[PDB]
Design a protein around this motif. Structure first.
Motif, mmCIF file in Angstrom:
data_model
loop_
_atom_site.group_PDB
_atom_site.id
_atom_site.type_symbol
_atom_site.label_atom_id
_atom_site.label_comp_id
_atom_site.label_asym_id
_atom_site.label_seq_id
_atom_site.Cartn_x
_atom_site.Cartn_y
_atom_site.Cartn_z
ATOM 1 N N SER B 124 1.067 -1.213 0.133
ATOM 2 C CA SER B 124 0.311 0.207 -0.475
ATOM 3 C C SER B 124 1.055 1.140 0.153
ATOM 4 O O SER B 124 1.918 1.559 0.300
ATOM 5 N N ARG B 127 0.504 9.046 -1.873
ATOM 6 C CA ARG B 127 1.210 10.040 -2.121
ATOM 7 C C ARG B 127 1.144 11.316 -2.866
ATOM 8 O O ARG B 127 0.134 11.391 -2.504
ATOM 9 N N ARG B 231 7.950 15.134 -3.483
ATOM 10 C CA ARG B 231 7.452 14.255 -3.530
ATOM 11 C C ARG B 231 7.381 14.084 -2.131
ATOM 12 O O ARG B 231 8.324 13.359 -1.437
ATOM 13 N N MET B 235 5.152 4.857 2.190
ATOM 14 C CA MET B 235 4.279 3.112 1.747
ATOM 15 C C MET B 235 4.970 1.497 2.090
ATOM 16 O O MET B 235 5.887 1.995 3.208
ATOM 17 N N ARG B 315 -2.522 1.773 -13.424
ATOM 18 C CA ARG B 315 -0.443 1.660 -13.952
ATOM 19 C C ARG B 315 -0.192 0.431 -13.910
ATOM 20 O O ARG B 315 -0.463 -0.508 -13.534
ATOM 21 N N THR B 317 3.775 -2.182 -12.659
ATOM 22 C CA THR B 317 3.912 -2.546 -11.178
ATOM 23 C C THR B 317 4.522 -1.933 -11.594
ATOM 24 O O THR B 317 5.573 -1.059 -10.162
ATOM 25 N N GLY B 319 5.148 1.550 -12.676
ATOM 26 C CA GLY B 319 4.705 2.369 -12.631
ATOM 27 C C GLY B 319 3.993 2.790 -13.806
ATOM 28 O O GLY B 319 3.529 2.317 -14.868
ATOM 29 N N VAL B 320 3.616 4.504 -14.218
ATOM 30 C CA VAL B 320 2.311 4.939 -15.181
ATOM 31 C C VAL B 320 3.442 4.457 -16.595
ATOM 32 O O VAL B 320 2.730 4.210 -17.484
HETATM 33 N N1 ADP Z 1 1.471 0.474 -4.342
HETATM 34 C C1 ADP Z 1 2.241 0.552 -4.475
HETATM 35 N N2 ADP Z 1 3.149 -0.471 -4.188
HETATM 36 C C2 ADP Z 1 4.741 -0.184 -4.275
HETATM 37 N N3 ADP Z 1 5.122 0.257 -5.268
HETATM 38 C C3 ADP Z 1 4.514 1.451 -5.527
HETATM 39 C C4 ADP Z 1 2.968 1.143 -5.623
HETATM 40 N N4 ADP Z 1 2.521 2.830 -6.505
HETATM 41 C C5 ADP Z 1 3.157 3.164 -6.770
HETATM 42 N N5 ADP Z 1 4.946 2.207 -6.935
HETATM 43 C C6 ADP Z 1 6.034 2.812 -7.374
HETATM 44 O O1 ADP Z 1 6.528 4.395 -7.151
HETATM 45 C C7 ADP Z 1 6.232 3.989 -8.092
HETATM 46 C C8 ADP Z 1 6.852 5.622 -9.553
HETATM 47 O O2 ADP Z 1 4.997 5.488 -9.797
HETATM 48 P P1 ADP Z 1 4.344 6.656 -10.675
HETATM 49 O O3 ADP Z 1 3.830 5.702 -11.583
HETATM 50 O O4 ADP Z 1 5.008 6.869 -11.601
HETATM 51 O O5 ADP Z 1 3.857 6.632 -9.778
HETATM 52 P P2 ADP Z 1 3.391 7.865 -8.731
HETATM 53 O O6 ADP Z 1 3.441 9.641 -9.576
HETATM 54 O O7 ADP Z 1 2.770 8.346 -8.062
HETATM 55 O O8 ADP Z 1 4.927 8.761 -7.795
HETATM 56 C C9 ADP Z 1 7.169 2.656 -9.028
HETATM 57 O O9 ADP Z 1 8.354 3.076 -9.197
HETATM 58 C C10 ADP Z 1 6.050 2.052 -8.587
HETATM 59 O O10 ADP Z 1 6.192 0.391 -8.868
#
Ligand code: ADP
Ligand code: CRN
Ligand code: MG
Lengths: 376, 376
Positions: B124, B127, B231, B235, B315, B317, B319-320
């Motif tokens: 979980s 952010r 940021r 988690m 998204r 694993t 990230g986006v």
């Molecule tokens: N629920 C989650 N658990 C573990 N890691 C996560 C999770 N959500 C996102 N991440 C990680 O965070 C990073 C950034 O992803 P992105 O999609 O850009 O997210 P954000 O914008 O919120 O930062 C990635 O490395 C992704 O694996």
């Protein structure tokens, strides 16, 4: 007269609402003390309301408690001592109303300090502030007084020669080119943006009679009529703190001698040392520091604590230096009053030497616990 | 001036060709709106062309609908409101110019979500981002500004303690293995590969003044100077979203407190909430989500429908900018403006449980369509 009008109102009607405030002034200003001092005035007409105005306007913060008051003239500290004393004692960790401040501007009393490892210390500097007796401080000085101070300062500074030969730059007539050079040299000061300063009234008539003076070698710098009548800074690359402190002492002495010849002197007394606008700058008003590379120690868990024990303070830097090294900090003595200039510079010299030993240990991947100092 | 030169050409000759583009900016930018706003600029010099470049350069994205524009400073949202307002409304389900943003960082207001099924939810995360007022945003900030931000962030964060005690790791100070390890473990931001990142100017000078701060357990982390000044991330493994959120609210509030003590404030206003680089991150700028195993739902017809229904976004694993691997999907709340932080996390908690339900049935051949909820 204006104060006479306020006196017609019950003290509690004029009493500031400091319920959400967090500064030294607010901490000591009781309803009783206010009623007790609000009718008083210095010969120049500075009143309690004038002294505390900035503290009323700026609440401050729990973690970072601001002073919340200023002196408008040399007499302010006497006339309103019942306010300043508690604030001074609190801000300077126990400095009592009866304590004495010793001044020591003799470089020879400094032990070592001429060899701070240049591999770590990128630059060294010592700065202080001075007030010219007979004139009101920046929050209260008139355009006339300020201009008179500027004239006195320029005369003296232009008499300095040799190592201290230099030139004056009035802010009023400063060109874009001069401005930029001074900015690149870290010698420029602009109209304050800090409300703590603005609310005191010290920024009036900006930039009238404000100016910057520095020697040709760029190791001695003087600011005229900014936060205080004079701000004096000695600096240079490397870790030769003794040399920096020697130029500091020599420059101050020569300037003072020049002032004395014209029957002027710095504001000073056995209890508060050199008198300045803000209580936090009393005594030596001295800040001796170094820009030092500590990439390992800077990232260490006990970095802040070690500095505290050595009675030192730190600030990060935002230049290419720390970017390339990954940890360059601006470290300086934390104390100001109750310690002589020599003892203050000595603590930085001694403190830095230990910081360097710790950095080297860390480089070798060794532990620094056995090197940890005890609170000084 | 470059813009002055461009103003020499008729607006139609400078108007970008967005005929094959599918992003929010493209849906709003008309020749008329362009001619009206192309001569404008913020105090920092950010222009409309700067705002829309990424959207001109990037017609689409392989996994999500993109905004197609960025703000270069706080003033961008005002000076170019005629562009942003329509986009903001479209991107955040109807949020109108007259609407108001509501904040709620009270963990207690979150009901349940303290035990999302561990056999499905791998981790979980919650952010958000914050901008330091007075500095330009990443698309436009100078090396100097960025370095100043890092300096301020490091000194502030060094004050956190307890379970939040931490350390700063500058990007330039990590080995190649150390950086990739943190990235692959989902803690650190990826290398500057994002199409938005590159085209908007946010990759300049990389990795200068970029880094990550995190507590010992890596359960609370802060990215410095990537897509936003800050940021803030909370988690941990498992599905205890409530604890993650509680730690998030706690750390976040302490961070704001620390910056305030230094006279710094985050960019914010009653209408747009917290100001960030990408319009999609306005308001709460909060993205709460989980890494969840959904091999069945993953390859199902109405999966994207249930998500759009629950106001959730999916998204990869990594990230986006990545795809889902091993059936592990990143499911989080889609909108960030017009809903409070608590309401947002609540939608994720409630949404996940419906997703696990659909999954549990799909794995039992009981392909259910009654569970299909009504779009919130
Ligand atoms: N629920 C989650 N658990 C573990 N890691 C996560 C999770 N959500 C996102 N991440 C990680 O965070 C990073 C950034 O992803 P992105 O999609 O850009 O997210 P954000 O914008 O919120 O930062 C990635 O490395 C992704 O694996
Ligand atoms: C372009 N993007 C991705 C991002 O800002 O990280 C949008 N969410 N619109
Ligand atoms: Mg991201």
């Amino acid at each position: 007269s204006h104060n006479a009008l306020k006196l017609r109102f019950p003290a509690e009607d004029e009493f500031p609402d400091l319920s959400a405030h967090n500064n030294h002034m607010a901490k000591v200003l009781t309803p009783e003390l206010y009623a007790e001092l609000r009718a008083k005035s210095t010969p120049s007409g500075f009143t309690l309301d004038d002294v505390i105005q900035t503290g009323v306007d700026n609440p401050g913060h729990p973690y970072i408690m601001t002073v919340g008051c200023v002196a408008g003239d040399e007499e302010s500290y006497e006339v309103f001592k019942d306010l300043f004393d508690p604030i001074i004692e609190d801000r300077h960790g126990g400095y009592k109303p009866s304590d004495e401040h010793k001044t020591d501007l003799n470089p020879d009393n400094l032990q070592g300090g001429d060899d701070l490892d240049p591999n770590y210390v990128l630059s060294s500097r010592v700065r202080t502030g001075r007030s010219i007796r007979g004139f009101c401080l920046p929050p209260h000085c008139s355009r006339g007084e300020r201009r008179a101070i500027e004239k006195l300062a320029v005369e003296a500074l232009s008499s300095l020669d040799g190592d201290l030969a230099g030139r004056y730059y009035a802010l009023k007539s400063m060109t874009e080119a001069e401005q930029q050079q001074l900015i690149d040299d870290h010698f420029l000061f602009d109209k304050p943006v800090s409300p703590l300063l603005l609310a005191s009234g010290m920024a009036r008539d900006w930039p009238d009679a404000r100016g910057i003076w520095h020697n040709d070698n760029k190791t001695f710098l003087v600011w005229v009529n900014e936060e205080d009548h004079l701000r004096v800074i000695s600096m240079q690359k490397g870790g030769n703190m003794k040399e920096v402190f020697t130029r500091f002492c020599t420059g101050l002495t020569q300037i003072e001698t020049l002032f004395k010849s014209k029957d002027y002197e710095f504001m000073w007394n056995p209890h508060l040392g050199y008198i300045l606008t803000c209580p936090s700058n009393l005594g030596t008003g001295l800040r001796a520091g170094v820009h030092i590379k500590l990439p390992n120690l800077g990232k260490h868990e006990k970095f802040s604590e070690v500095l505290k024990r050595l009675r030192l303070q730190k600030r990060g830097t935002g230049g290419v230096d720390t970017a390339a090294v990954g940890g360059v900090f601006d470290v300086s003595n934390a104390d100001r009053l109750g310690f002589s200039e020599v003892e203050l510079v000595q603590m930085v010299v001694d403190g830095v030497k230990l910081l360097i030993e710790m950095e080297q240990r860390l480089e070798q991947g060794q532990a620094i616990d056995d090197l940890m100092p005890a609170q000084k």
